[PDB]
Ligand binder design. Sequence first.
Ligand code: 5BH
Length: 127
Amino acid sequence: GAPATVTEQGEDITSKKDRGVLKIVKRVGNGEETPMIGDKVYVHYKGKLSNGKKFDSSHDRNEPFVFSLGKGQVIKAWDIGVATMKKGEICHLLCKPEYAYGSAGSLPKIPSNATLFFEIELLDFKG
Ligand SMILES: COc1cc([C@@H](C(=O)N2CCCC[C@H]2C(=O)NC2(C(N)=O)CCCC2)C2CCCCC2)cc(OC)c1OC
């Protein structure tokens, strides 16, 4: 699947290089600029537990997902991953539990020790 493809071909984008967050660019974005800490970022995304038990999609809500980058408003994997995206880029991200919800998980959607997969499209950002 897409999860297995990211394991094989994904770039490790973690500081520690522990393969906790792996990225493949699926669509190349525009220009060179990437978002700064505190930038308001607008995305569409699809997400699922790697094994497949749960699925989530901003498209199904007809609403872009917005957050402030690098503030812990989202799982670490997103703060790391979205920082690397250009406007219009689409990437796939595989996220180990240590960059997501770890041992605790989150009731009721995320079990303990869950690896998460995401497709993310960066629509826009602004400081
Ligand atoms: C743990 O709570 C949620 C998590 C998500 C998804 C999720 O993991 N996130 C939503 C998209 C941004 C990344 C990540 C996230 O940071 N979630 C939040 C968090 N942990 O602070 C920030 C927004 C919702 C909770 C998962 C849903 C199950 C399939 C895998 C992705 C969606 C959710 O609602 C649609 C959640 O409920 C608020």
